[PDB]
Symmetry: D2
Subunit: 493 residues, 4 copies
């Protein structure tokens, strides 16, 4: 890992439309903060309704029939994506540092993980651009029938702050590969890295209007996008609460298509024949990864009674050893939480666990005088009815539960309104096959956790969302299907 610039200069902080930088129409700005210190990094243009309208107009004009973007060879769309990746890899060190500065996550993780996954995602979809075929169809009668897979059109894309650059790539990848145009609303907490990528989108050679980015708040710029009469489709990643607002706004306006990637309360199931060392460490990673700020965090650690006590012991020891501090320090495993609001929600959730009957085993408090650092926390003997067991905490707070049978654990794991992910640790073929089938979750990991691949779809069952990102499946929401049926003189096989 290369030595970072621990004070990266910010170059982009305005609204991005038609490959040009603009102030908000209202000329207002908003600050973004370094969560490791609480100090303002810079000001950023605050986009609102009128700024979104301009963006949507630029997108619509870029998507017009006969335009450079509509006529561009599909294979060339692929090259542009590949070019965008090369530019990002060129500025990898800068982008990882800036990612850390604005989000809080350890620089080493931003560099080796986040940036790596951004590149793999973009390079994967570069390859899909000219391979997502429609069909020729042997319909009855003297007819020739076939389908075109056309772009859905103007796509509103609203993303969260936990993985700023990665969330942007999961959005742009499929959308651009299939020839759509984009109006993207980045999180107010973490707008900087995505704005710089906007500049690279320009340098890459994407026609103006194809990607537009409006920094700003949710109920303003986000809402204006979800209710816009000329936005054909919206993709939203964030809280379940706002996911319902997006869905309602879509139906209330123009019936735009919607996919949603929401929260979760994912069960990590450790069977009694599991490799203890592997399972303990992976359970740790499953919860504490990215300051616990991960949609699919293994926040319900079910442990078979035969190994419960030993597992808790080692999980506490590992937790107590987790290094918390400055994200630019190569030794830090956990940076601060994203902002003050998160910081306090988490602390609140810890208090409920204490009063509700959970056994605090370690941590449970503030870890530093400055920034938003929280001590790695582990709760023992958690019950399904407890608050910390049912609600997404989005912090370094671990829930260790206890079970006896496979049939018990399936029922308790599935007794949730969430269904984003699940995992099973066991050496037994039958138990593995049975659990992964029985569990209601979009992703079931076996003997591992948080294994993401650009090739494999990701998304939620139930209230954890609808639709899927990554893989071939991620192309589906960005495709409008047209059937063409033609009368022919004489149909032959």
């Amino acid at each position: 890992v290369p030595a970072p610039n621990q004070q990266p200069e910010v170059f982009c902080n305005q609204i991005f439309i038609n490959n040009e930088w603009h102030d908000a129409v209202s000329r207002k700005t908003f600050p973004t903060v370094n969560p490791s210190t609480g100090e303002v990094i810079c000001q950023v243009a605050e986009g609102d309704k009128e700024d979104v309208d301009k963006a949507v107009k630029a997108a619509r004009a870029a998507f017009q029939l006969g335009s450079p973007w509509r006529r561009m060879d599909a294979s060339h769309r692929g090259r542009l994506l590949n070019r965008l990746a090369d530019l990002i890899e060129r500025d990898r060190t800068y982008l990882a540092a800036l990612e850390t500065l604005d989000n809080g996550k350890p620089y080493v993780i931003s560099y080796l993980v986040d940036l790596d996954m951004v590149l793999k995602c973009l390079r994967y979809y570069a390859g899909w651009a000219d391979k997502y075929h429609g069909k020729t169809i042997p319909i009855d009668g003297d007819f020739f029938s076939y389908t075109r897979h056309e772009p859905v059109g103007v796509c509103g894309q609203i993303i969260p702050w936990n993985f700023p650059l990665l969330m942007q790539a999961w959005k742009l990848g499929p959308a651009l590969a299939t020839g759509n145009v984009v109006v993207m609303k980045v999180a107010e907490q973490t707008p900087l890295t995505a704005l710089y990528v906007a500049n690279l989108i320009k340098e890459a050679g994407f026609p103006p209007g194809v990607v537009n980015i409006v920094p700003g708040f949710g109920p303003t710029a986000g809402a204006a996008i979800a209710s816009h009469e000329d936005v054909d489709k919206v993709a939203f990643t964030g809280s379940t609460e706002i996911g319902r607002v997006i869905q309602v706004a879509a139906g209330s306006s123009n019936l735009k298509r919607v996919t949603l990637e929401l929260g979760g309360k994912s069960p990590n199931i450790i069977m009694s024949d599991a490799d203890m060392d592997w399972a303990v460490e992976q359970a740790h990673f499953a919860l504490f990864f990215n300051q616990g700020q991960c949609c699919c965090a293994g926040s319900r650690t079910f442990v078979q009674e035969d190994i419960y006590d030993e597992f808790v012991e080692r999980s506490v020891a590992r937790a107590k050893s987790r290094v918390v501090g400055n994200p630019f320090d190569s030794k830090t495993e956990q940076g601060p939480q994203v902002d003050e609001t998160q910081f306090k929600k988490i602390l609140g959730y810890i208090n409920t666990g204490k009063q509700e009957g959970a056994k605090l085993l370690c941590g449970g408090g503030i870890a530093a005088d400055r920034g938003y650092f929280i001590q790695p926390t582990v709760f023992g003997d958690v019950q399904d009815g407890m608050t910390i067991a049912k609600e997404e905490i989005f912090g370094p707070v671990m829930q260790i539960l206890k079970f006896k049978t496979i049939e018990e654990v399936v029922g308790r794991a599935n007794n949730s309104t969430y269904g984003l992910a699940a995992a099973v640790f066991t050496k037994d073929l039958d138990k593995a096959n049975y659990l992964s089938q029985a569990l209601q979750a979009g992703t079931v990991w076996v003997n591992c956790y948080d294994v993401f691949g650009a090739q494999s779809p990701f998304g939620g069952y139930k209230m954890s969302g609808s639709g899927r990102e990554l893989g071939e499946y991620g192309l589906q929401a960005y495709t409008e299907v047209k059937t063409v049926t033609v009368k022919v003189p004489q149909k032959n096989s």
Copy 2:
């Protein structure tokens, strides 16, 4: 066509749950009418919220892990669909007669067209039951990744009155093929035929709770389904207006998945090099088919100016000769409209057509002293700004417009919030291709119209809906994708 019983007995008129017939909890009933005579056929149980709750309860139970329906071989689901089709074919005469009694469409059409399409749809999806594969995926690292295409679960299906049996089949086909369970709410105007099919579903061998049917009204039974906390997915076919309500109810409850098949104002474009005779007869069929009550009716007939006058004259002559009358008469081409409400609505739009300066060329009034018959009506010299050019009439009212260039006609045809279908009539290869590409419609017919194939998807762009039915694409909405990612000792290609 075999001689029908013009007074078919009614055997099924209650609520269908767990393969059993029940009265409404409230014991309330509602009348369904013969549109040809305006007389009441029989009373039908009026299902409401509580009856929906029982249906969902039964559907959830049937969908439980380890149930007969979840463990049944995919191939055997196919056989069951095939058995249902065979039973329907056995009772074809009866069902076609009952369809005509309750809906109004010509008995000859019910038999040779509707029933035929019901059989073709069910047999088509019987073949998909064991063929909609998931994927094995070459993900990075030492992992084996694959997807399961599981059923989405409890599916609410809400259908209209214009093709009662066919609409039922378009819904059951893909849903049962992929192992889902159904709570279906049929149109209050035409509940009878679908209820008798429920008897065939039972006779066929489908497990109890797999298909449940609740006859009743929209804002009561329909809204209860759309807002139900334990319904996983809703498929709605009907008006654009109610489509908004469905989408809102989804987001306002449990984020159930939504697909919508709505209305349209489909352009039918006649180029100056078209076969006049063929184009006139097809334009007639495109509008007047099924009493004009077709989502994708060609209700904007664009004709190139060099052939406009001749086209109009011939179109008028054909409309004047269209036989309107008793649906059981083998000579009738057009029965009555479905009910009083639709009847008045069409007459209302004809008034608006006169008031706004559209040239009334034939018909324009009531066509009988009993029932809901309307004279085939043709408006000429129609302009884009007119109401009859913009709104879905859903009656035997034809609009003929004039255009000059290809450029012009593409823009005018696309200048609409609808986009369900469109057609192009020409002998020119390039014109056919440019148009089929330029048109924003889910189906584009060339030198033909209303050609539906079980193999070819159908659905709308824009506010004509979202998602597709028929073909392989019809399976997508009824599938929930699960990624399983397993750690392996050593990954090899």
Copy 3:
């Protein structure tokens, strides 16, 4: 009562013909050695007639070419219904001609035939071509047209089933067929020809020529107007087919040949389950199965235990009259196979393999052979390298997982393999390392109409069953058209 034979001639254009030469060959009941009846002996001239009728039926604009794809599917389903109608009869006739136990014919073979035909009935109108976003102002798409006149040559071990595996995909995709059934078991396929006619398939779409290999079979392989050949049988003949294809008109070729499939029992396997499945893996259908687990690799820590149970089970296996419900194992198909198996057993004894049970003739009438088990078999022994195709089990000892992989893969065959273990990692590693077209885990001989089957290496090329089964029966055509202005 034995089933009466109704069909014993050459089937062309939905009509029954004698051979041009008027020659006939007898077919025999292997349980008694007695002649069942005479059968028309097709040769080159009869093949030429069948091919001509096939070509005519495939002509552009013909009823079969113009027929809706969905309707081809209905025809397949109707053919299935008729077979099920006559299920009892076909099962019995299958037993009479082949030798396999009647109960197995009825519950297994006939069941698998119905599932195959009904599965492919559903594919008829679902095998889409593609529309393709090519560079430039062009629109590009592909058609999946039928390959054309398809010669199909099949073996005697599962006569109805092999027929179905061939007809299913060929007919679903609109091809026409000239089929050459095995001389040892021609009867049941000929009765199905009558059903094909009853179901309503147009004349010339399916033609069946009974006869011998070097005559009727070679005439099909070398024919100048046959577009595609599909052969199931011995590796030796598979080579002949291939050469004939190249030497003639370059017709497309797929092959399903023999094997020497390893069945691998790890030390943590379910012992009872493993023993029963290993027994079935080898002895099923008188051992006359291409994918028979004829190399049973057993981990050393459970070797003796496995062997003892395996020998006990083999000694309880009932051999005799296939129409007797007690019978688990009927006779071998004919005298040549009978003698050949006895020969292999002798090499086993001579080469130092340990005869644990059987080894001899099991009846003084018919071609019955005792269930036989060899222990301590070495990789270099004849019975370990060559296909026996009889009720002769080889049990080999191994120690490590890396060892069994190397030894299992050290073969010119690669049709099938199996692994018995409770361990997730061992199962996944082995199923990946093994060079076999089908890898069973904790089961054996599990065939699905939905899942492809075929060999690596010299066990064949191409796959049958599943979607993959349609590939070899499809010819791809690209149509690329200039358009005024390409848009996404």
Copy 4:
């Protein structure tokens, strides 16, 4: 287009095994000639049987389970292909010059056409590396069943001289994308450019033994590959005659898998309603492209009788204006034929045509006193029975035939043992659709010719070959299918 060095230096002229350069075991070398001057460029190592054995052993070693190439992420195979493309583009000017020196084709063509098509092919298949999924299958019973798409193994690839670089790419692209290893035998007439690419393959980062290249002759090196006991698959492009020898060798040896791309006599059909200017120029291109040395050349130009006389006059005019000379000169449209053998073969067919009674309208003789240049030649009033109408000439020799009806031209066009390609020129939709359906050809062009796309498959019907190259279809022949069926405790949908 950069001015080339007309005398480019040769850096590679040995055998390429395990990323190393080797002299032949025999130390034998063969000279390769500049077809434009008849002069020796340089000597090249002559591979034979023992050199093939070494290459195959190296390929087998590289393909061994657990090797770097087998364990390499599919995504990384994709990255390597892209790197190879970049290096080829980096050295584009040099490769274009060397191609022309060894083959004879115009440098402008080598640069703008061949090199461009190479880059597109490799970059296309780069995207496939991690997207060619196997399936998860809903088999009957309590089982989980799926397929793996594994590589076929050691692939012998034998290529011709007409498109040396392009043919290499069409082979390496799909083979490498799917993780196979290659032993490639390049044409003895044009070994130079493929050997340089080997150097780039090494520079790109492909593991040693993954691609091995053996220059040498057909019946020696080529046959050694076709008959090798340890080669799993062979793909051959060349003459139908040798195609039969390859197929026989496969069956006589180890039953390796075989795909063939052979010659043809493709019909170019000009309807009376075609655009004359466009049809004439495209018909010219279709035949004369690449000195006529193109497998799918339109060497049977059927022209409807009403436009025959005019079409012929303009074709002859265009033929007489075609510039023949030095390939490096920018005005040159036609270079020399590849070698002396092809030179005499073409003079033979020209003489055959004259003695057969075909009307010689222009050319028909030698065009220069040095090199192998042949005058553009046009024969008129060609009949189906003529030899020049049936056999592949592979030279600048055009045949023009007359026809009357569409039904007639179909029969005459299909009456051939070849079926590689065909074209139709017309403005009529119906004629285009009927013909494209009726013609027995692997590729049918409509109002265009020689339009190749990396996305669209190419291959012959009948004796023009078997299997397809390019597109997704090109991956099939390089994939071995494995079904894995696992017993599970309880199967659910």
